[PDB]
A paper describes a structure:
The XMAP215/Stu2/Alp14 MT polymerases are among the best-studied families of MT regulators. They localize to the extreme tips of MT plus-ends and accelerate αβ-tubulin polymerization in eukaryotes. MT polymerases recruit αβ-tubulins via arrays of conserved tumor overexpressed gene (TOG) domains (herein termed TOG arrays), which are critical for their function. Each TOG domain is composed of six α-helical HEAT (Huntingtin, EF3A, ATM, and TOR) repeats, which form a conserved paddle-shaped structure.
To accomplish this, we removed the N-terminal ankyrin repeat of DRP (herein termed DRPΔN). The structure revealed a novel assembly consisting of complexes with the stoichiometry of 1:2 sk-Alp14-monomer:αβ-tubulin and a single DRPΔN positioned on the top end of TOG2-bound β-tubulin (termed the 1:2:1 structure). The refined 3.2 Å 1:2:1 X-ray structure revealed an extended conformation with two αβ-tubulins polymerized head-to-tail in a curved protofilament. In this conformation, TOG1 and TOG2 did not form any interactions with each other and their adjoining linker became disordered. TOG1 and TOG2 were specifically bound to the lower and upper αβ-tubulins, respectively, of a highly curved protofilament. Compared to the TOG square, this ‘unfurling’ rearrangement required 68°-rotation and 32 Å translation of TOG2:αβ-tubulin hinging around interface 2 and TOG1-αβ-tubulin. This transition promoted the concerted polymerization of TOG2:αβ-tubulin onto the plus-end of TOG1:αβ-tubulin, and consequently drove the dissociation of the second DRPΔN. The two αβ-tubulin polymers in this complex were highly curved protofilaments (16.4° inter-dimer interface). Comparison of the αβ-tubulin dimer structure (α2β2) within this 1:2:1 structure to the unpolymerized αβ-tubulin structure revealed that polymerization is associated with a 5° rotation and 10 Å translation in the T7 loop and H8 helix of the TOG2-bound α-tubulin, which engages TOG1-bound β-tubulin elements and the E-site-bound GDP nucleotide. Thus, the 1:2:1 unfurled structure represents a concerted αβ-tubulin post-polymerization intermediate promoted by a single TOG1-TOG2 subunit prior to straightening the protofilament during polymerization at MT plus-ends.
Residue numbers in the entry:
A (entry chain E): 14 to 43, 46 to 259
B (entry chain A): 2 to 40, 47 to 279, 283 to 437
C (entry chain B): 1 to 42, 45 to 57, 59 to 360, 369 to 441
The structure:
Amino acid sequence: LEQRASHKVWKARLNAYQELNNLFTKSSVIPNDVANYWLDPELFASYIVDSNVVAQENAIIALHTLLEYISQVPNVSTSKLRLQWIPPLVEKGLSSSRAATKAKATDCIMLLTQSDTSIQQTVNLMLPSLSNKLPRLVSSCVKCLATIIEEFGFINVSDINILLSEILEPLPKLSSHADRNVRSETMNLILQIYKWFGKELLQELLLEKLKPIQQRDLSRMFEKYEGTIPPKQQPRLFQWQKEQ
Amino acid sequence: RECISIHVGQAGVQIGNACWELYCLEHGIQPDGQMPSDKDSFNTFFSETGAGKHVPRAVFVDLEPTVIDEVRTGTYRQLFHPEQLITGKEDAANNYARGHYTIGKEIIDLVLDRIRKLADQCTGLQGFSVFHSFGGGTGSGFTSLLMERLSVDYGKKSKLEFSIYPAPQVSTAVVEPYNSILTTHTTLEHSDCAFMVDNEAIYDICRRNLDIERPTYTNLNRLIGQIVSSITASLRFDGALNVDLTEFQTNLVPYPRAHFPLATYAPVISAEHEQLSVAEITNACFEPANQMVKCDPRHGKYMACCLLYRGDVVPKDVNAAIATIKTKRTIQFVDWCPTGFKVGINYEPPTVVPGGDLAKVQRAVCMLSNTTAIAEAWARLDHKFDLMYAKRAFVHWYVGEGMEEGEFSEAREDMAALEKDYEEVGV
Amino acid sequence: MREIVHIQAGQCGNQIGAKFWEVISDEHGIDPTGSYHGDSDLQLERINVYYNEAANKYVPRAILVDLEPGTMDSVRSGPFGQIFRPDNFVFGQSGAGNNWAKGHYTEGAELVDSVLDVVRKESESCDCLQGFQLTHSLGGGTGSGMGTLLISKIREEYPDRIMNTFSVVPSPKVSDTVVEPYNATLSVHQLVENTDETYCIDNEALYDICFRTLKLTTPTYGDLNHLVSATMSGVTTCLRFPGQLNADLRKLAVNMVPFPRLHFFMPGFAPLTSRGSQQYRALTVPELTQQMFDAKNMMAACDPRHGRYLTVAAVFRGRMSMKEVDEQMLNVQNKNSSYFVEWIPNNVKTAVCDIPPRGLKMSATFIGNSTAIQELFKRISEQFTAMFRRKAFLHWYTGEGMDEMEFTEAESNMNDLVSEYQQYQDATAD
Ligand SMILES: Nc1nc2c(ncn2[C@@H]2O[C@H](COP(=O)(O)OP(=O)(O)OP(=O)(O)O)[C@@H](O)[C@H]2O)c(=O)[nH]1
Ligand SMILES: Nc1nc2c(ncn2[C@@H]2O[C@H](COP(=O)(O)OP(=O)(O)O)[C@@H](O)[C@H]2O)c(=O)[nH]1
Ligand SMILES: [Mg+2]
Ligand SMILES: [Mg+2]
């Protein structure tokens, strides 16, 4: 039934996603050739976009347990995965209206990010999503973007100035968005940028271009932060850090 | 010299039609822009093409093409250049936040560009005359946005307002108190002088004096255009009183926040016994039934009073009538005011629309008085505002269009302060 | 804010939708061939809202959806069935079995992509899309299930446009199934969070009107859909005829919806005419006003005496004294001030249209955002819990993928909606 993962009827597809979730949790760790879902990542990239919201949720939780299963040497093939998987995760996982479907998609983006060497080859893919029609999508993936900075942070990224400027470009547009949640989640992203740098920087670059009522809020938010000006430690480590 | 008129929203655009129609009638300009007079003072409102065509220094802005389309189709389609008629596709739906934040920001650069064109065709630009409504999304939201941008670019020049105070008789929206408070707050520090026009006052004057059981917008706009003409006539004709926009503040604005004069026009006679004297039309300017903002000046104190006569008016007849009124009525001045009336006379007769609802008069007068009693209009808005905002009704519409809810509180705190400032200057 | 895309889903959706297009195509002088045979020019002033061109005549901007091809053919075989676009008929051949889950999750989701393609097609030929309009039944399977899915799908593809619905309520007096409270509860749970405005069309009210007012012993669906098509023509009058008040969908929603979740309207109109030819009452303006604000003319089983009106939209049609209308509309307010919210000044708005509906000279349509509408949800919530306590018939929804928690949430959110409608029914001005 491995090929029924793309069967017409939804219930057969829903079953294969559960069967897959069992395989990735009940298989070998050295792994079967049957677990050839690395080298053809378009398989799960197709499952995440399941036209049935129920079986789509099971394809994501199966992708999640697969994604932590692959945390076994030597799978440096995680570069091909992020390109093929997190655009489907962002476009129809974070955008999803189901709280469970979205919660696991954010959990898969976290795993695919710590499989990387830095956060840049993950930010660049979900940066285009910041300019989508659906506000709930840009509301959700600016919160995700803010939580991949809160935990991972800017380390080992090639040119931080090209990455800082790239993520600071839409921030004035996002903080004037019509949606109340898009604005609210952008104010939280500014706090995360504030926590890694100082206050001097984003006043030079950003805070002047916000509504005065908004930069008063950020001032109140900066006062409520007690930790040191930059966090003396990453709340979450990459895979290559937990090794050597 | 030159003055650029800006007309925002349906109210601003439709009133600008009645005004520029009356301007052309007074100056003898035809709909095609041609005038028969060989061998401005009216060039302050019109420009001259090399082919002898006289074009208004006006800009018409709307977030919906419906109203301005009628302009580039009716009688005055050739009067304006099509670059002066700016429209969007999606309007603001009686929402300030749509006109100021969401929709209006996608046309603000286009409007300022077409204005810079007119401003660059002028040698000595005096300033701007903004026409808009208080209740509409475009007339409240986009106008306050434009006023913020004009103070940045054309910072030195003056800006005058002709705002349309809402009234339930013709109210097309429930949230009109919200929009009124929001635009009055964000425009207060950018406007040098603001002439409010209570639609209820114009509505009742049309019912009472013109015997129109149910006035249309055309009735209200033609009556309003009569007053706006009397105010701008000092700029279009060489006179003594109010010869430039800076003189409106000098004669009517003692403090930057108290820049809301009260206009009272007379006579308004239906087109169906005999001519009124100078003393009778001057007496009518102190009858609150002839005001354009419903309030009782007898319950307030004056800070300025200017009589803008036009027609067959002799100065000695004016001073005779003034001396009678000053010693037969109750005009309370603040004890720090020059207490003296200013009088301007324009010997051209008051022009009306041919075949219209107003009869031609030998003489007329428009009184511009800055009284504290106009704060009663702010109280009627602040009350309707407070009733709905205490429940946060209709607030989600504004928050869903880029507005932070705290901006409601800020705007109401300002109107609270403005009411205190009128109370203080009052006593 | 010009063109409106119309959608009808399910059995009831295509029934009342086809009757609605028959009514307005006549009022706009459009024969089934699509040609214009009218007289006045007001009928063509704002015809671009609901119709398109063919330059070879006018074509409705409507999309017809159903999981069962049975209603597809009964519509095309109807008198105006030849005017709709052939490509705009999107029909599956399976069915929904009066199951909300089958239409929303299972077999409606495998058809909804075909509908969004037709939705996208009609939206590109729009100079400026105003909003959407959906007719459906909350107690069924396709209109309820797939309809709310279509709403949520349009919501995520057109987050700028207004979502308006004409949802009819199930009732034991004219019921086809026992799981209608389940479907209606699951559907209301969607409308409260997805639609900008929703006209509650209670079948229990429509039945009581046909029975106790029109004096019909056995009312048929045609007897009920006559009141629906009349009510729908009235509440859309300001949208297709050149009016000043409540011209587009948003301006109406900005005046009628003070709080986002309280967008459920109680429509009514007068006079109540039967399916006969015409009456000779020739109602006066004071009569049209008394009849409008009367519970016997409400299309929703709720007594306005039991709740307060947050906002009100009245629409008069026909040549009459507009001055006499203001005196009556002002009278009913200051004579029944307890039933109108004080903390919303000027909450009642009255519009006038010179053109009456075909068959009458004077009519008046009422749109009210009353707190009494909680009686309707209380009624549905009662029947829902009566079965859900024992989990009767639940296997058909769980068998299609639904978790049991979805029922608890929909029930909870509906009771929250009832409590909020009671919340502002108790708020004062003080
Ligand atoms: N006197 C007068 N008042 C008008 C006229 N048109 C609109 N108003 C007033 O304007 C208010 C509504 O704002 P509008 O100008 O119609 O709306 P808008 O500026 O076009 O902005 P939108 O909301 O996007 O349509 C109401 O209080 C009306 O009384 C007019 O022609 N004459
Ligand atoms: N007023 C009215 N109600 C209907 C009509 N057809 C069905 N209904 C109601 O809709 C419910 C059944 O849903 P239905 O539309 O038949 O199933 P669907 O096709 O899956 O949406 C029942 O409660 C009926 O009372 C109709 O023509 N008129
Ligand atoms: Mg407009
Ligand atoms: Mg059925």
